[PDB]
Amino acid sequence: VKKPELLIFDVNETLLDMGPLENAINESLNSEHAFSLWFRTLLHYSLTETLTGNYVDFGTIGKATLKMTMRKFGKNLSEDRLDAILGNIKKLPAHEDVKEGLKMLKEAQIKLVALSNSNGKLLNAQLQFAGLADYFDAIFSVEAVGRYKPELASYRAVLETMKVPAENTMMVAANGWDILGAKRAGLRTAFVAREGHAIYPLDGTPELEAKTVLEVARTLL
Amino acid sequence: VKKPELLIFDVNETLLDMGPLENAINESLNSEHAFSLWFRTLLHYSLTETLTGNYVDFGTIGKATLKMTMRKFGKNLSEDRLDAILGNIKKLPAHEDVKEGLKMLKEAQIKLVALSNSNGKLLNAQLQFAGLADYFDAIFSVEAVGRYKPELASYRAVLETMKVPAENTMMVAANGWDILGAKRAGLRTAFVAREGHAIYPLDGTPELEAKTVLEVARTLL
Numbered sequence A, B: 001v002k003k004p005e006l007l008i009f010d011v012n013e014t015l016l017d018m019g020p021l022e023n024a025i026n027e028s029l030n031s032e033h034a035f036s037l038w039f040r041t042l043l044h045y046s047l048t049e050t051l052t053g054n055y056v057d058f059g060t061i062g063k064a065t066l067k068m069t070m071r072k073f074g075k076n077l078s079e080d081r082l083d084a085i086l087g088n089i090k091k092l093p094a095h096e097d098v099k100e101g102l103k104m105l106k107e108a109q110i111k112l113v114a115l116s117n118s119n120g121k122l123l124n125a126q127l128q129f130a131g132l133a134d135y136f137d138a139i140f141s142v143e144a145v146g147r148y149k150p151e152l153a154s155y156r157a158v159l160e161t162m163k164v165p166a167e168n169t170m171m172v173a174a175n176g177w178d179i180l181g182a183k184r185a186g187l188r189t190a191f192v193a194r195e196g197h198a199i200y201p202l203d204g205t206p207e208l209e210a211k212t213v214l215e216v217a218r219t220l221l
Helices: A019-029 A034-051 A058-072 A079-090 A098-107 A120-130 A152-162 A176-184 A213-220 B019-029 B034-051 B058-071 B079-091 B098-107 B120-129 B152-162 B176-184 B213-220
Strands: A006-009 A111-116 A138-141 A169-173 A188-192 A208-210 B006-009 B111-116 B138-141 B169-173 B188-192 B208-210
Touching: A006 A152, A019 A034, A019 A058, A019 A079, A034 A058, A034 B034, A034 B176, A058 A079, A079 A120, A098 A111, A098 A213, A111 A120, A111 A152, A120 A138, A138 A152, A152 A169, A152 A176, A169 A176, A169 A213, A176 A188, A176 B034, A188 A213, A208 A213, B006 B152, B019 B034, B019 B058, B019 B079, B034 B058, B058 B079, B079 B120, B098 B111, B098 B213, B111 B120, B111 B152, B120 B138, B138 B152, B152 B169, B152 B176, B169 B176, B169 B213, B176 B188, B188 B213, B208 B213
Parallel strands: A006 A111, A006 A169, A111 A138, A169 A188, A188 A208, B006 B111, B006 B169, B111 B138, B169 B188, B188 B208
Antiparallel strands: none
C-alpha cells in the first residue's frame, strides 16, 4: 500500500469524543436518541444553508436545530440551559487512540491537516482543549471556503493549498458522507468505525476501514 | 392577502400521512424515534448526493439510509423485511384535511402543482393511491430537475414551466427547510404545522402559518 503525502482529518467524532455534548443533550431531553436526531438535523440544515446560497457558523445552526429538536421531546429549555449544553462543543476531549495515531503518522513524515465544519474560532478552541492543535501543519475551517462538507470545493481547496495532488491525499473520517465527498473529489479514504456510525452503502465504500485512528496509522505503516 | 396564481405543494408530509411508514419502521427498530432519525438521515444524504455532483432516486437512498439506521438500534433486518417496510412509501393515505382543502383552491381557479423529492414513477404511484393526482395540473419530480429540494433551481423550474412569476407563487410545505428554500427562491410560503415539524428559526419564518391544508385554503379565501 502506497503512503499518502497528505492526511486530511474530520474533527468532530473522527478525532473528538462527542460524549460530554451527547450526554448533556440526551439527559436534558430525556432520551438516548436526542443527540443523534439533533446532530443529523444540524448536518441537514448546514447542507440546506449551502444549497440555498447562504453560510451560517456551525454553532449558530446548532442552537437553532437544538431549539427545534427539544420540542419533539416535549421539553422547553431556557436559553441559559441551551447555551450551557452547547458549551460542551468547546470541551470535547480527544478519543484515547488519536494522539498515538497522529504522533506515529507525523513521525513517518506525513503532512497532517484538519478539515472541520466548525468555524475558525470554534475549531481553534476545540483542538486547544483536546491538545491536538500541535499535531497539524494546517487547520482548515469551512468558513475559509464558505461551503460545508461534503461539497467537493472544500476538499480541493485543502489539496491546492497544501500543494499535494488528490491521488496522494487520504481523507480520514468517521462519517459516511465525508468519505463519499472526499472519494468524489478524487481522494483516497479511511473510515474510522466509531460507535453508531455506518458506511454509506451507495458507492461510499472507503479504501481502508479501521476501528481507531491508531489502527488507521498502523495499517498505513 | 393577495390570492396566488400558483400553489406548489410538498407531497411527503404536507399532503401524505407518513403513518404507515413511520409505524412500520418504529415497530421494526423498537423505538418511537427510529422514523425521525432515519428520515432526517435520508434527507441529509439526499443533499449530500446533490452537493457531490450526483443524483440517486429517493427510494434507493431511503433503503441505504435504513440499513445504516437499523444498525444504530442494534437490529439486522433481512432485505425481504426492509423492502416490506419501505413498500409503505407507495401506500400513504392523504391527511383528512387535504382533499377538502385542494377542492376549495381548485374551485377558486388557482393552479395547483406538486413538487416532491420522490422520483416521477414513485410520485405518480403515491398520488394515485391517495387519490390526489386529479387535483394537480402538473406533478414535478426532482428527477425532472436533476437536483433535490431545497435547491433554489427546483422551485424556479416550476415557476418557468407554469409561466407564473415568483411573487405570484406560494409554496405550501410542512418542512422548515422547504419553506427556507422557497422563501430564498423569491416564492410566498405557507407552513402547515403538522405534528413533530418546527419552523427553522434562522430566517425561515413563512408568510402564513396554518395547521392543515384546509386551514391554508380558508386563510387565502
